């Protein structure tokens, strides 16, 4: 049935502005402070979106908060890549309507290499001809793609939920495909794409952590929730206590 997709389309977050003053110079401090503010603003929408996902409330409340705190980077990068693909044909990084990165900003932000990887991800939506439905299901699955090595409060409930979202992705593929071999090829492609998000998120996790530690010395502002989650949960990822769930080796 279209119920699952009806829900995902219904809860998809709308446009979010960074509040960036485009009249000011493209300095490291200004660009990163605006990216951080955008992060806080998007985090609010990720929370509301997540709480409205089918079966999400079945997870222990502490696990609900944990998975959002571990996966927000990947979720936001994936969504930004989609915005960039649909808006500027992946030509530039469309973080927000008021915060679009060109080559100069990529350099000034001091994360040019990471921006290059994000652009590559954005382009994949075009090369693979990802449909809005495939994008929506893949994004939902990203929320359930990173957990503690020791497990969650109620790991069994999480494993069941994750399995159901993989099932939904399989269904969206089999929707317009009679041949099973073509379905297998598509599923391989989509899982490969999903895996590719993790190394990018990891580089950004490292970058934002190092930035938070020296933020006072570089005049970069971090909103309250961002500073909280980056100092408490991000280090768990960087130290290996929390790891992404990869489909492929």
């Amino acid at each position: 049935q279209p119920i699952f997709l009806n829900v995902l389309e219904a809860i998809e977050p709308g446009v979010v502005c960074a509040g960036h003053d485009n009249n000011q110079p493209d300095s490291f401090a200004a660009l990163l402070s605006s990216l951080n503010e955008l992060g806080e603003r998007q985090l609010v929408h990720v929370v509301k979106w997540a709480k409205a996902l089918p079966g999400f409330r079945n997870l222990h409340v502490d696990d609900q908060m944990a998975v959002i705190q571990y996966s927000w980077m990947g979720l936001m990068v994936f969504a930004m890549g989609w915005r960039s693909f649909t808006n500027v044909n992946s030509r530039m990084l469309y973080f927000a309507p008021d915060l679009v990165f060109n080559e100069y900003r990529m350099h000034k932000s001091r994360m040019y290499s990471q921006c290059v990887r994000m652009r590559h991800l954005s382009q994949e939506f075009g090369w693979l001809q990802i449909t809005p439905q495939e994008f929506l299901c893949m994004k939902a699955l990203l929320l359930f793609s990173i957990i503690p090595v020791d497990g969650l409060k109620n790991q069994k409930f999480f494993d069941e939920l994750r399995m159901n979202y993989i099932k939904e992705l399989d269904r969206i593929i089999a929707c317009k495909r009679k041949n099973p071999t073509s379905c297998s090829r598509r599923f391989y492609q989509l899982t490969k794409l999903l895996d590719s998000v993790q190394p990018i998120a990891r580089e950004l996790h490292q970058f934002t952590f190092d930035l938070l530690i020296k933020s006072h010395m570089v005049s970069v502002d971090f909103p309250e929730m961002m500073a909280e989650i980056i100092s408490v949960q991000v280090p768990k990822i960087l130290s290996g206590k929390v790891k992404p769930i990869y489909f492929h080796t």
Binding site: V44, V47, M65, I68, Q69, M225, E228, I229, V232, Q233
Partner: peptide
């Protein structure tokens, strides 16, 4: 909680 701000917003 180590993330009191996030938790407060989430719990609302």
């Amino acid at each position: 909680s180590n993330t009191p701000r996030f938790k407060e917003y989430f719990m609302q």
